[PDB]
Structure formats: structure tokens, C-alpha cells
């Protein structure tokens, strides 16, 4: 697909850097015509099959494709897409609030009820995504951003659709992932994937949201992958002493090895802990 060929620097005033990845850099920017602030994600094109650097066109095309289809309050919105000889620039909505977990670290421990306030927003967004048969495939704290952190009840936005996929009938999908600590066993054992994987991550995220401790993070990468696969974790009284029974039951119904037995996003919204 053909993207905007004009130089992004002709319509935007690129500036400060917000974050860096192996094949991408996101800089803050200001649109010249509106004076509005956005986020500029510079994805490095592979532009040479043999090369293991840069991202493949197919992968970029897919993220853009999914992004273009998204339109929900709890999901980042794609503004424009430019490209030149080396990069594909995605002008994304700006979540000036930064990471939800950084904002939370700056306040007194949230009550379980307040924690649920944020989690619900996450669920809403994932509810939208799964309703569109789209799996994020990379849900993790760092991808839970805040639109504005200087407001009564800050809004959360799910970002990074680089791993997102359009789950369609007819053909199974084997593997694609990131951080072991947050992926589901299906991903670890390269077994067929689906919307269930996102639900697993949700359970992992709520667990951290409540205890502040990761449920599967081990000493070595291998240990984590083994912890996740063996689906072994615990609600050690040290961290889950002030955690309701309903809270734990929610996490339990999500941290299930067998996908078909795991709670669906529809179920989670109806769970008594969420009410
Ligand atoms: C205010 C702020 C700070 C850091 C940001 C971002 C925004 C940010 C943004 C986006 C992405 C993909 C990465 C981003 N990062 C990198 C870190 C993501 N955990 C994005 O799509 N919008 C952002 O504001």
C-alpha cells in the first residue's frame, strides 16, 4: 500500500524522544497546520530480505492495517502514515500521561477498587479488539499508557500493535511474541494462538497491578518460560495479604494453561470482581 510520500518534516515539527526500540524510535511532534501534538514512530524498513535488521513490509503493512481499523477510547488512534527511503513514519495519538505503572509508582498504593478502575478500561479496549477478532499479542504494563495524567480519572490507552494480528478462521497461527514474562504458554510451546493469549496477559497484568510483583518472572529467561509453561505461580501472603478472594479468583480464571478453559474477555467483564 502507498503511504504519504511528502517529507514528514514538512508538515510536522519533530522533537524530543519518548522511547526507543530495536527497530523503531518514537519522537514527540507538533503538526504545523493545527499546532497539535502527536507521537511520531519511526519504523526502520528492512528493504532487503536477507537483512535481519529493520522490519519487513508485511509486518508494517499489518500494523498499519489493524491500526487503521481501530477507533476506541481505550486504544491509541493512528493519525497519518508517511514513508521515505529508509523509514515508515506512523503519526500516532499522543498519550502524554506516559506509562500507567509509572504514574501509579508516583502515588500511594491504590485500593483494590481503584486498581479495578484502571483494569476495567484495559478490559474495555481489549473487548473492542476481540470484538473485531483482533489479538494484540503483546499486552504488558509498558503498553498500558495514559492519555493525560493531570486529570481526575486519567484515561488509559493500549499502544503498540506491532504484534497484533487479525485472527481469521480457516488457518491456525503458530508463533509471534515478545517478553516471556508476559506471554501465554501457547506462545512458549509454539502451539496454535488466538484471542486467549491476550486474556492470559491480562491476568498477568492484574496480578502485577495488585501485588506489584510478577507471577512468572524468574532468574533466567529459561526459568520464566518454564514458569509460564508449567503455569506455576502463587499468591504469597507477602504480596496478596490484602487481596480479596474475588481478585485472586479472577487472576486464576485467566492464568489457565488450556486456552479453551481460560476466561474469555466477555466472561471477565461479567466476573463478580468486575461485577
Ligand atoms: C508521553 C510518552 C512517553 C513515552 C512513550 C510514548 C508517549 C509513546 C507513545 C506511543 C508509542 C508507540 C510509544 C511511546 N512511548 C515509549 C514508551 C512506551 N512504553 C504512541 O503510539 N503514542 C505515544 O504517546
Curated annotation (Swiss-Prot):
Induction: Up-regulated following treatment with IFNG/IFN-gamma. Isoform 2 is expressed in normal intestinal tissue as well as in colorectal carcinomas. Transmembrane segments: none annotated. It comes from the Eukaryota. ATP binds at residues 18-26, 41, 93-95, 99, 160. Ubiquitinated by the BCR(KLHL20) E3 ubiquitin ligase complex, leading to its degradation by the proteasome. Removal of the C-terminal tail of isoform 2 (corresponding to amino acids 296-337 of isoform 2) by proteolytic cleavage stimulates maximally its membrane-blebbing function. The active site is at 138 (proton acceptor). Residues 12-274 form the Protein kinase domain. Belongs to the protein kinase superfamily. CAMK Ser/Thr protein kinase family. DAP kinase subfamily. The autoinhibitory domain sterically blocks the substrate peptide-binding site by making both hydrophobic and electrostatic contacts with the kinase core. Calcium/calmodulin-dependent serine/threonine kinase involved in multiple cellular signaling pathways that trigger cell survival, apoptosis, and autophagy. Regulates both type I apoptotic and type II autophagic cell deaths signal, depending on the cellular setting. The former is caspase-dependent, while the latter is caspase-independent and is characterized by the accumulation of autophagic vesicles. Phosphorylates PIN1 resulting in inhibition of its catalytic activity, nuclear localization, and cellular function. Phosphorylates TPM1, enhancing stress fiber formation in endothelial cells. Interacts with KLHL20. Interacts (via death domain) with MAPK1 and MAPK3. Interacts with MAP1B (via N-terminus). Interacts with PRKD1 in an oxidative stress-regulated manner. Interacts with PIN1, PDCD6, BECN1, TSC2 and STX1A. Interacts (via kinase domain) with DAPK3 (via kinase domain). Interacts with GRINB. Interacts (via death domain) with UNC5B (via death domain). Interacts with UNC5C (via death domain). This is Death-associated protein kinase 1.
